[PDB]
Every structure is written in structure tokens, then in C-alpha cells.
Design a protein around this ligand. Structure first.
Ligand SMILES: *[C@@H]1O[C@H](CO)[C@@H](O[C@@H]2O[C@H](CO)[C@@H](O[C@@H]3O[C@H](CO)[C@@H](O)[C@H](O)[C@@H]3O)[C@H](O)[C@H]2NC(C)=O)[C@H](O)[C@H]1NC(C)=O
Ligand SMILES: *[C@@H]1O[C@H](CO)[C@@H](O[C@@H]2O[C@H](CO)[C@@H](O[C@@H]3O[C@H](CO)[C@@H](O)[C@H](O)[C@@H]3O)[C@H](O)[C@H]2NC(C)=O)[C@H](O)[C@H]1NC(C)=O
Lengths: 438, 156, 49
């Protein structure tokens, strides 16, 4: 028996589905989203880490001149300085007074622990959603793991469930993502091959194990001081360290809709938005023949107390007449009030009570026990407490019923004014018709 | 690593007044978990006092090394529903204090327009039906004189 | 109230009775230790000072 429904994408919401086969007794299923996980699709762009300047020892040529040679190293720098007269601890070598030359050499290299402390620059698109749903009904409990796209059917106690694609297409990750340890940043990193000194991605490595490196940190060499051997140089500080110091915010503490960001793999969990369509396919054994279920006649519903609070703050009573005692499948046919249970024990006494949760001043919904029907209306008082630590258990609908107090007042006033206007119109038409009949 | 003390919460109307007692610089941050969040984070050093908004969507705050705690506001107000017409307006003004005023204004203007139109119709009908007998020195027909109040009560 | 002036109060200096409200809460001891942990809101008199 094919059936379909739409359930909210809110973690912990007690969604109950009513299935009515005309030849059998009604059934109520309870579905609940225990957990979600929104996984995007990533393409690694490059890897950034702190750099390390390698400065080999200078070559001082005593009584001669030296020639610089170019090399294929990242950000290589080489120069030759003429007229040096170095010194050492015991005496000044290079006997020639002024015919000497010093060669200075330096280049940049990826740090020592770049494979342990590095930031990854990604591109995120076409996220795929996942869930973990608990389904209970009849006498079967059990939680299953599903993909939320209309292409994965999981069987729970002989019933096939397909969870359709999410209603919306909202993802908290922008096009470009930077991931560092356990934090995600919505950043616009420069493309590979065009980083800038002193900021994020001054040195860019295509992969943590990649040999190629692109470094751009404005390394420069300066003439050595007289009577010393030191190879001076100047260099703009690391871009990774300053990115760590002034990255600013995150996505973990900024994401909308109250959903946790995590890493390895990147995913945004328990992120409440949209609706999740559901398709089912139940076997003939799940239902009960109408002969077995009790018969319910003369169903009357009265509301004892009502309070539009987050918890289940309303109490409902049903009176009926029955031939034998058994079980029925209660349900509320409007999302104004969300019942608490999906089964109730009917007995020959003729009284059963149910609890509901609502968020409107005056609700109006129709409740059914087994095959019967009844309409309930109530007047509800606000709660006194200001803040609670649990989420709402109602669907958050606030427009009152057309028979409520406020709308009854509006109806009465509008009816009085309409009667006045109709009287005026009738008087004027009578006058003109008396003028015409002559 | 140490876990800092839990702060003291005092509940308000869609607000939490929050007393913070640190021993060493701890990080305090919160966000409103709605469609458009209210982001904030700070390095609390000395004993301070914070007020943070908690809409109906809820919010979470992260104090030191403790786990984040979520708080949800509840549909509370000050008016009296199901009372006199001037109390339902208060009740629906405590909640949503921006559409109640607009709806009340719209309904009031509609009522005024309708009542003015009706009064105009009565005036025009009286003018039409009392001018024909008011161009000749004729009898006002006391039967008609009593029914409609014309300008001459008894003088012709 | 805890954390502010007068979180503990006594009728007089030598009085036997004492009212204290400082939010003293005990915690579960760590595995393999004997240390009876707790947490408590700091003194209100010092923060008044
Ligand atoms: C031992 O020390 C002497 C210096 O007292 C060194 O002699 C120096 O040798 C270099 C090259 O071998 C000379 O540089 C060039 O020499 C050419 C020669 O024509 C000249 O045209 C260039 O302008 C330049 O000066 C340098 O002049 C010379 N110094 C002298 C002779 O006083 C000698 O090389 C040292 N021993 C060894 C093994 O190096
Ligand atoms: C369907 O299965 C789930 C999981 O087996 C049932 O939820 C479980 O309900 C029991 C009974 O309340 C929970 O045990 C107790 O939980 C409290 C919570 O604080 C704990 O303090 C007690 O010491 C005891 O462990 C159990 O935690 C809970 N499991 C989960 C994952 O929530 C559920 O009731 C079943 N449905 C039906 C209709 O039986």
C-alpha cells in the first residue's frame, strides 16, 4: 500500500504519520530524525604552512673574484660582494688587503613540520545530505541510517521507506573554504601561483607530499658589515603565522540555523531547515482486519485545560461507547495541535485522556480514535515562565480559529456595520425607485 | 586543562542576564541560532555581567572549556486573552509588537470609511426625498412629518 | 544571592546561626584519584570590596 507524507527537518520533532486503508483499521507510524550530516564535495587546491629560510655558509675567496650562478630553487637569491676583509677569532685570513670577494646565498624551503601543522584550501560544491532516522510503530522499534535523496530505500520490519530530497538547497559553506585542524573559514584565498608576501598563502604547495613549491616573501640580501662574516638578509615575516593571529571569527561560531560545523570530513550536523518528503510501501501484514479492531461510536471530545507552552501543556478527554476493549490509533488531523501518543487503550468504561501541545490562543482540530471522529475546540492561557531549556514541541501556528473570541468579536462588529450599510443602501434604492415609479 | 565555573543566569523577557566570574582570561561567545544569527565573542578577563538576547528560535553560549548550552524563549506575554477587546490587543501586542498595530489601524480605518459612507447615504437620501415637497407651499403630511425629521417640525 | 554582597549573613559576630548561599556543587572524582572535586561561585565580600 503506497503512501506518502512530508515531515519537518527538525531534530527530535515527534512526527506521526496516519495511514488509512479503507478496508482495515488505521495505523499510526512515529518517525523521528535523531541526527543529520550535510557533507559537501571538496577539491584540494593547495597547502600552506610556515616557511624556513635556509642560509648556507658564505664562500670567501682569498685573492680572487667569484661569479654568481643561478639555480632552480623557490625564491632563490645570490649576490657577490667585492672588497671584503673578513676576520676570524685568531686572525684575519685572506692576506690580500682588498682583493677579496664574498658570495651570499639564501633560499626558502617548506618548514620541518609542514605535514603536521598546515592549512588546506578547498572548493566546496553540491553538498550531499545524510540522516539517521528512528522509526517505531506497532511493536517494532529500531533506528536506521539513510541517504536523504530519493535514491535509497531501507526496509524496516517489512516496510520500504524512501526519504525524498530536501525541500531547499541551502548550504552554509561558500564556494571557497579554508580548513585548519577543526575549524572552517569562509575565505577567498588567492589562486595558486599568485600569493603575496606577508599574508595567507605566501608559500603554496599543491599537495603535502608535492615536490613543487611556489614561494614569494621578498627575500633580500644586504652587504656584510666590515670585519665580519654573517650573510645579512631581510625578509617579510611568515604569512601563516599572521593568518593564525588575525584570521578572525570562524564558521563554527557563525553558522546560521544553529548547526555544528565539524572536520575530517567537513560536515554541518543537525542543521534545521526545510522539509523531508517520505515515501513508504507497507505489506498487508502491517494492518489489522476491521473485524479484529474494536468499534467506536458516539465520540465526544472535551478539553480540560489548555496552555500554549513548549511542553505538552494541554489535556483532552474522549467519551465513546465500545463493545470490547483493545487498542486504537489516535491522531490529530491538523498541525495546530501535536499529540503525544500514537496508541490508546479503549475500554468499556467509555473514557480516555490524551495530551497535546499547541501554540495558538484558540485551537480547532479534529481528533480520531480508531475509526471514529470528533472536533475539539478550546481556550488556552499563556505560560508564566520566561525561558526553558528544551525546544518547542508544536508546529508554531498562531492564527486563531474563526470561532475564537477575537474573531467572534471581529465578526460581530463587521456584521453590525454591514447591516448598517445595507440598511442605508436599501433606503436610498427605495427613494430612487419611488422617484422612478412616478 | 581546567573547566571554568558555570555562570549565574537570570531570566527576562527574551533576555538572559548572565553573571560571569573568571579566574584567568577565558573566552565567552554566543550566537542566536535563527535564520540570521547574532554573532559575538570576547576574552572575558575580570568579573563582568552580560545581557544576551534569546528569541523564540533560541541561542547557545560557550563559556570557557564547558560544553555549549542552548536556551529557548517561550511564548509569554502580559495581556489577557479572551477578555475585553482592549485586552486581546494587549495580548497580541506582547507577541509580535509590529503587526498588531498595523492590523488594528487597518480595521479602524475600514470601520470609519464604512460608517461615513453609510451616514452619507442617509443624508443624501433625506435630501432627495425632502426636497420635492420643499419647493411648493404644501402640506408636509404629518404622517410623513413624524416618520422623518425634516427642518419644519410643525411650521408647515 | 551568590557572587554578590551578603551571600553569607550572620545576625551578629558571635551568633551561632549562619545563612550561606554560594552555589556549592560537587563533581565526580576522576578515575584513579582521591580528591573530592567541587565548584563554587567566588566570594561576594571580596567582589563587593
Ligand atoms: C700568497 O699571497 C700573495 C699575496 O701576497 C698572493 O698573490 C696574489 O695572487 C693573486 C692571484 O694569484 C693576484 O691577484 C691578481 O693578480 C694579477 C697578476 O697580474 C693582477 O693582474 C690582478 O690585478 C690581481 O692582483 C694578487 O695580485 C697577488 N698579490 C700579490 C702578488 O701581492 C698569492 O696568490 C698567495 N698564494 C696563493 C697560493 O694564493
Ligand atoms: C526504542 O528504542 C530506544 C533506544 O533503545 C528507546 O529509548 C530508550 O529508552 C530507555 C527508557 O527510558 C532509556 O533508558 C533510560 O534512559 C534514561 C535517560 O536519562 C537513563 O537515565 C536511564 O538510566 C536509562 O538508561 C534509553 O536511554 C533510551 N535510549 C535512547 C537512545 O534514547 C525507546 O524508548 C524505544 N521505544 C519504545 C517505544 O520502547
Amino acid at each position: 500500500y503506497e503512501h506518502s507524507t512530508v515531515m519537518p527537518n527538525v531534530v527530535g520533532f515527534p512526527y506521526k504519520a496516519h495511514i488509512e486503508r479503507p478496508g482495515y483499521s488505521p495505523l499510526t507510524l512515529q518517525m523521528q530524525v535523531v541526527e543529520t550530516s550535510l557533507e559537501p564535495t571538496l577539491n584540494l587546491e593547495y597547502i600552506t604552512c610556515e616557511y624556513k629560510t635556509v642560509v648556507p655558509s658564505p664562500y670567501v675567496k682569498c685573492c680572487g673574484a667569484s661569479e654568481c650562478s643561478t639555480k632552480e630553487k623557490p625564491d632563490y637569491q645570490c649576490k657577490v660582494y667585492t672588497g671584503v676583509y673578513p676576520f676570524m677569532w685568531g686572525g684575519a685570513y685572506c692576506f690580500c688587503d682588498s682583493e677579496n670577494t664574498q658570495l651570499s646565498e639564501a633560499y626558502v624551503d617548506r618548514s620541518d613540520v609542514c605535514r603536521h601543522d598546515h592549512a588546506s584550501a578547498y572548493k566546496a560544491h553540491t553538498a550531499s545530505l545524510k540522516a539517521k532516522v528512528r522509526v517505531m510503530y506497532g511493536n517494532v522499534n529500531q533506528t536506521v541510517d539513510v541517504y536523504v535523496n530519493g535514491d535509497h530505500a531501507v526496509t524496516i520490519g517489512g516496510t520500504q521507506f524512501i526519504f525524498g530530497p530536501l525541500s531547499s538547497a541551502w548550504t552554509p559553506f561558500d564556494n571557497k573554504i579554508v580548513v585548519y585542524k577543526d575549524e572552517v573559514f569562509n575565505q577567498d584565498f588567492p589562486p595558486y601561483g599568485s600569493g603575496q608576501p606577508g599574508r595567507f598563502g605566501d608559500i603554496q604547495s599543491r599537495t603535502v607530499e608535492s615536490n613543487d613549491l611556489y614561494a614569494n616573501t621578498a627575500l633580500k640580501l644586504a652587504r656584510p658589515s666590515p670585519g665580519m662574516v654573517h650573510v645579512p638578509y631581510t625578509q617579510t615575516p611568515s604569512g601563516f603565522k599572521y593568518w593564525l593571529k588575525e584570521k578572525g571569527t570562524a564558521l563554527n561560531t557563525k553558522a546560521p540555523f544553529g548547526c555544528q560545523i565539524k572536520t575530517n570530513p567537513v560536515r554541518a550536523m543537525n542543521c534545521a531547515v526545510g522539509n523531508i518528503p517520505v515515501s513508504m510501501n507497507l505489506p498487508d501484514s502491517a494492518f489489522t482486519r476491521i473485524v479484529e479492531a474494536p468499534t467506536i461510536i458516539d465520540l465526544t471530545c472535551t478539553v480540560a485545560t489548555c496552555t500554549h507552552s513548549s511542553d505538552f501543556g494541554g489535556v483532552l478527554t474522549l467519551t465513546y461507547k465500545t463493545d470490547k476493549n483493545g487498542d486504537c490509533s489516535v491522531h490529530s488531523h491538523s498541525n495546530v495541535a501535536t499529540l503525544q501518543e500514537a496508541t490508546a487503550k479503549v475500554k468499556t468504561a467509555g473514557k480516555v485522556t490524551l495530551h497535546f501541545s499547541t501554540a495558538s490562543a484558540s485551537p480547532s482540530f479534529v481528533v480520531s480514535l480508531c475509526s471514529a471522529r470528533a472536533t475539539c475546540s478550546a481556550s488556552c492561557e499563556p505560560p508564566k515562565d520566561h525561558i526553558v531549556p528544551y525546544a518547542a514541541s508544536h508546529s508554531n501556528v498562531v492564527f486563531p480559529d474563526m470561532s475564537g473570541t477575537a474573531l467572534s468579536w471581529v465578526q460581530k462588529i463587521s456584521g453590525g456595520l454591514g447591516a448598517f450599510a445595507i440598511g442605508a443602501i436599501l433606503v436610498l434604492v427605495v427613494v430612487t425607485c419611488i422617484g422612478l415609479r412616478r | 586543562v581546567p573547566m571554568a565555573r558555570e555562570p549565574t543566569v537570570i531570566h527576562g523577557k527574551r533576555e538572559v542576564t548572565l553573571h560571569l566570574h573568571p579566574d584567568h582570561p577565558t573566552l565567552f561567545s554566543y550566537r542566536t541560532l535563527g535564520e540570521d544569527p547574532q554573532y559575538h565573542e570576547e576574552w572575558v578577563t575580570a568579573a563582568v555581567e552580560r545581557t544576551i538576547p534569546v528569541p523564540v528560535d533560541g541561542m547557545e553560549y560557550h563559556w570557557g572549556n564547558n560544553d555549549p548550552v542552548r536556551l529557548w524563549s517561550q511564548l509569554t506575554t502580559e495581556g489577557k486573552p479572551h477578555g475585553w477587546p482592549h485586552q486581546i490587543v494587549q495580548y497580541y501586542y506582547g507577541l509580535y509588537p509590529a503587526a498588531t498595530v498595523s492590523a488594528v489601524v487597518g480595521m479602524s480605518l475600514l470601520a470609519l470609511i464604512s460608517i461615513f459612507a453609510s451616514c452619507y447615504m442617509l443624508v443624501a437620501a433625506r435630501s432627495k426625498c425632502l426636497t420635492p415637497y420643499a419647493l411648493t407651499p404644501g402640506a408636509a403630511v404629518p404622517w410623513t412629518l413624524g416618520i422623518l425629521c425634516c427642518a419644519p417640525r410643525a411650521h408647515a
